[PDB]
Amino acid sequence: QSMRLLRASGRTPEAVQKLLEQGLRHSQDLAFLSMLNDIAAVPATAMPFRGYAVLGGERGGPEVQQVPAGERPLWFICSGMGTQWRGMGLSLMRLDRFRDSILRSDEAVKPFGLKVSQLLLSTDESTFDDIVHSFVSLTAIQIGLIDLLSCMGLRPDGIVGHSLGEVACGYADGCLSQEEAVLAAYWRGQCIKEAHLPPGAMAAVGLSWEECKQRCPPGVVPACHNSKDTVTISGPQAPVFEFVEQLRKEGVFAKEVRTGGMAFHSYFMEAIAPPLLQELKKVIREPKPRSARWLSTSIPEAQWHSSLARTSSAEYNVNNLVSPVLFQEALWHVPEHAVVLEIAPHALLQAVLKRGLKPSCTIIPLMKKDHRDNLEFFLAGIGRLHLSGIDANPNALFPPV
Incomplete structure (x- = not known):
């Protein structure tokens, strides 16, 4: 239960190591660690060295690092298909905001007779071989991640999706509600399954x-x-x-x-547009407009000034399914010193992202397929936000003291 992330700040590396050690020696004093976390919010200007440690758990060990001056923009990348695995998100279920978000998603899918949480719990190896099970659970786990991020007050400067990831993007952008976002993942899958x-x-x-x-x-x-x-x-x-x-x-x-x-993002999917468009028309009523933060991977740049592009419509979503994934072209726009978070139940794009962006960008994954403990892994990632200059206080993720 008690595993926490401790972040530290200081004028020297040693200043930070000493802090990380005091916290290690008081690992079980939550009020103490909560207080140390509140402290760490000190601009690099004043305290140019930062560090973190995940107290509890195996790959616990400190990272300390000089933090650059300059402001660094935060980008969310929502991954697409293939990222599913058995036991997805069970470790993150320990964070209340996460499991609240997943239960809320279950509610969107109470009719249709699915409970995301039960899919996650399934010890059946073939449970995510089902396209609906996968689609819905990817997007639900992505929403959870986004909720954990938002619960620390992290607003993205940019948003980018990959195929189905563009559903999650709408949620992160404030275009689609949780219920709309989840249902879009459902119908996308169910329409195909039927086809x-x-x-x-x-x-x-x-x-x-x-x-x-x-x-x-x-x-x-x-x-x-x-x-x-x-x-x-x-x-x-x-x-x-x-x-x-x-x-x-x-x-x-x-x-x-x-x-x-399946032969996704090709002509093979055009047979699925009419049904899906009909279903999503009922789901996404009054389509809200996409912000300028959200770069489309379903619509070419030179037509972003577009009615289709203007909002996260049932139309926009059907276009995604049928059109190619213009991901590289979206990454081209990511600025020089970006901090990039892969939002996925498994950080599948890490390698692609490294290649498609530069030794200036910091790329942070949030979950790993079959990781012993993805809460440890998630928190290490949040720790790296501190190291790269982003203010993300983990106290929010945990019960108050």
């Missing part, structure tokens, strides 16, 4: 976008633009498996990706 489409596949491929366009066999299209030389292509299964073989053989990095036989 019984032909067998498709997607593959990660070490070509550029234009090079894929040229080189891709008919019926196979570049789908997910993740970096200058990482495109996920999508199409009917056979050609996608054949194209990857061709590529492997010629020395190109070309990993297959499990998407449950």
Whole structure:
């Protein structure tokens, strides 16, 4: 239970180490650690060294570091599909704001006969093989994460989504409510499940976008633009498996990706638009406008001045499903010293993000697939916010003293 994050500030590295140690020696005094956390909110100007330690737990050990002058912008990246795993979010369930958010999500899905929390609890290995189970639970876990962030008063300067991640983005941007956001994830999944489409596949491929366009066999299209030389292509299964073989053989990095036989973000999805648009029309009534913080990955830049782009409509959401994921192009806009948080039940984009951004950007993941303890991992990440100059007091995550 008692595991807490202790953040420290000071004029020297030693000033910070001494603090981290006093807290370690009073690990069980919550009122004490609460007080030490309130203190750490001191500008780098005044105290240029910062540190953190996760008290309790295995990979507990201090990080200390000089904090740069300059203001650093905070960006949220909401990851897309593939990030599911059995036992997702069970460790974070210990934080009340998280489990409150997940129960609130269960309520959105009481009809339809699903409880997100029970999906998470399932010891059934194949529970997230179901597209609805996954979609809903990704987005619910993303909302939880966003709630934990907001509960420490962290407002994003920028927001960016990847496929289904763009649902979570709406929540983070204040376009879509929790209930709308979750239901959008539900219908997206349920519409597909019902559709019984032909067998498709997607593959990660070490070509550029234009090079894929040229080189891709008919019926196979570049789908997910993740970096200058990482495109996920999508199409009917056979050609996608054949194209990857061709590529492997010629020395190109070309990993297959499990998407449950589905050829996402391609023409294969157009059969799913009419039903989905009908359902989401009833869900997202009175569509609220997307802020300028939220860069679209479903709509090209040169048409951001657009009615479709103007709001997080049922229309915008259907467009996401059917259109390619223009992720690299959105990252291009992320400024030089950004602090970037991957908001996902598993930080799958970390590698892509490193490549698509620079040794100035700090990239922080929040959960890891099959981690012994994702509360430890989450808190270490929040600790790194301190180290990079962001004021995020963990006292909010925990019961008061």
